[PDB]
């Protein structure tokens, strides 16, 4: 079938897209930087809020194209509580407990699979409760996911170069646990669960009325 | 319960243990040994009560609560009665005989 | 008949039980200890709620339902990480006739967005004591309170979705009590009882009640709660 | 050597034990349920006395000597009927510079005449907390005090004939260490543990303390007691 949760959910998709430029007047525009979350896709975002408790490993591929040799890129995962750069050019970068893949351009997109990291035993798409006790509510340390930061490679002196990063993400070896009912309400925030009211389905007219 | 074949309801039987204070609330009485009686179910609850003696004071307590007061339908009745009943077990005993408190030449 | 349960406590009743996901409550099975304390089993009875023509419906959090209960609500204050499954007995007394509906649903981990988007709000307007908190037909407005409108149950679901969970109805006209054994569901063994609700308990009347006139206003829905199960991490030293 | 008890409470020590009567704490073996509670078992130590050159005496009066220790003291604001033994070590730590003799002994039901005949004294005149009280030297010549001349234990009896009693003499020059094994003794099976004390411990040193120059000027008695056997009257219905 084609029902199997597996499957359901075994699909990839976009899910960050970002440019960065080599010289800017901006530090913070020198380098792409993206919490790994799955709440900034809505489309996605409603496939994963109809289970309460997930556990899959994550498979990242990066479409990166640049405009004005041949150009390198450091892609650079950090583990969740592992160093975080805040510059171009840091210690951050140099960190040996951080993945990284040096990929040139022209050729087939760059790639690996982050395994399921967490030390509970599922990840929680809800958590009813608080972190310290009663900038807290519904947010636990459990399901937290690493970082990606990407970074143009180049020489001791930087030339222009605008480049555009696009994430793609897709789950693998998916199983879930406790069904919830779909959602009705749109999304109105990317870490709550703040909504306004809306009517249960859209009116007939008569309870007699059948017409096609 | 005496009350009509058609009342229903709940009552809190609780028992306390003798030098022991009563209850004071419903909440309180609920954390000691209790019955929950339904009068739609039942008509009649047994205690057997433990620990009696002269005491010649500490004495255990029976109290009884509303939970969830008496619901009727229309066109009945809008009171009713408990009645109570009082008898040994087996396990007494009795010793030296003296005359009755009760009588005045 | 009557089965007469007894655990120190005498419940008479009796539908049959629902149970969870046809998983009963169960133990646990070093460098953690652990150990069960088998004398907190027993019922708690929660006071009754009257159910009206105006009422919309109710919920309860827990297990901060019971942390003012004797000896269960004294292990959250020692013991740091606890577990423990439930079995909840809900149950209604009315003549036949009165006329009704309600739906007795357990929904775990029940987040619930507040009244007002992206405003914060106290960990009091939505779990205090053994009280019962209410819904409301309309739609909240106010700064400091969990969104209540009935009709998307706090979540922004359907009402009508929520027998997805464990749950039972109690039609007025056939029976009128509900049994459901929820089992204790987390994502970790044994996690802190007050930073956390494993889940909600929901009555929610579909059918408003009617009654015609010279009889009773009210039918009293009285919640009755015993742990089974429950289990601790131990506080001595290893050898 | 070291016999290293433990309960959930270590104690190291080692003379040997001196069984009462030579009979054992025992459980007793209806219209009266009863029920031990096997948790109040494990040593509450005592705080040290100083022996010092000064000192004549020392008693305390059990089991009001217990009411404020965890579990066991709160056993008797409960149940209104109690017994049980005890077991009792008495252990000094001196030098071989030292000399000196106790004697250690548990006299079962002591009462004690007033200071100043036929004159009413309070309840706090030799039992309150866990206070060790003290016998004085010189006769007493207080109205609100019991009679503590030394020399007649305060009940009119030979200081000498206290050897009839369950004992042991803790001569510093050969030992350092006593235990006394007492059972419930009583004239009915159980009694209220607040109108009555069982029983009095008292250290009584014959031959004063002496320790030549630049030496510790005091020696510490340590008394750990672990209540043994205990039983009460139930709390819950008959059938």
């Known amino acids: ?212 | 319960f005496c009350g009509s074949a058609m009342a229903t309801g709940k009552f809190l039987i609780a028992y306390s243990p003798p030098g022991a204070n009563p209850p004071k609330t419903r909440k309180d009485a609920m954390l000691g040994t209790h019955i929950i009686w339904d009068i739609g179910l039942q008509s009649s609850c047994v205690l057997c009560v433990p620990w009696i003696s002269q005491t010649h004071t500490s004495a255990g307590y029976v109290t009884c609560w509303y939970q969830t007061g008496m619901i009727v339908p229309p066109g009945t009745p809008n009171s009713s009665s408990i009645m109570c009943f009082a008898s040994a077990c087996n396990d007494f005993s009795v010793r030296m005989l003296r005359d009755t408190p009760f009588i005045s030449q | ?239």
């Not at chain 3, 150990?35 to 109710?58: H, M, N």
């Open chain 1, 1 to 212: 079938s084609e029902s199997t949760v597996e499957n359901f959910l075994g699909r990839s998709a976009c899910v960050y897209m970002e440019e960065y430029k080599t010289t800017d007047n901006d530090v913070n525009k020198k380098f792409v930087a993206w919490p790994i979350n799955t709440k900034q896709m809505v489309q996605m975002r409603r496939k994963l809020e109809m289970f309460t408790y997930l556990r899959f490993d994550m498979e990242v591929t990066f479409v990166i194209t640049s405009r004005q040799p041949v150009l390198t890129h450091q892609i650079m995962y950090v583990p969740p509580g592992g160093p975080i750069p805040a510059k171009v050019d840091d210690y951050a970068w140099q960190t040996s407990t951080n993945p990284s893949i040096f990929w040139t351009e022209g050729n087939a997109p760059a790639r690996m699979s982050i395994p399921f990291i967490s030390i509970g035993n599922a990840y929680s798409n809800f958590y009813d409760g608080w972190s310290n006790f009663d900038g807290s509510y519904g947010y636990n340390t459990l399901n937290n996911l690493g970082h990606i930061y990407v970074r143009h490679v180049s020489g001791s002196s930087p030339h222009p170069i605008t480049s555009t990063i696009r994430v793609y993400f897709k789950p693998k070896h998916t199983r879930a646990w406790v069904p919830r009912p779909p959602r009705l309400c749109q999304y109105k925030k990317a870490f709550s669960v703040d909504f306004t009211p809306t009517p249960i389905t859209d009116t007939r007219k008569d309870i007699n009325t059948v017409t096609t």
């Open chain 3, 1 to 239: 008949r009557s089965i007469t349960l007894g655990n120190s406590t005498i419940t008479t009743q009796e539908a049959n039980v629902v149970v969870g996901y046809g998983r009963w409550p169960t133990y646990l099975r070093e460098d953690q200890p652990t150990q069960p304390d088998v004398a907190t089993c027993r019922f708690y009875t929660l006071d009754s709620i009257k159910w009206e023509k105006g009422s919309v419906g109710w919920w309860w959090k827990f297990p901060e339902a019971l942390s003012d209960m004797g000896l269960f609500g004294q292990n959250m204050q020692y013991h740091y990480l606890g577990r423990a499954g439930y079995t909840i007995h809900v149950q209604c007394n009315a003549s036949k006739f009165h006329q009704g509906c309600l739906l007795v649903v357990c929904v775990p981990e029940a987040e619930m967005g507040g009244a007002v988007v992206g405003q914060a709000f106290s960990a009091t307007a939505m779990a205090n004591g053994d009280k019962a908190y209410e819904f409301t037909s309309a739609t909240q407005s106010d700064q400091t309170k969990v969104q209540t409108a009935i009709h998307n149950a706090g979540m922004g679901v359907g009402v009508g979705n929520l027998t997805i969970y464990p749950h039972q109805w109690i039609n007025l006209r056939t029976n009128n009590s509900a049994t459901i054994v929820m089992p204790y569901i987390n994502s970790v063994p044994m996690d802190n009882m007050f930073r956390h609700y494993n889940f909600t308990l929901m009555v929610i009347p579909f059918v408003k009640l009617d009654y015609a006139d010279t009889a009773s206003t009210y039918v009293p829905i009285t919640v009755t709660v015993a742990p089974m199960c429950a289990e601790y991490n131990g506080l001595r030293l290893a050898q």
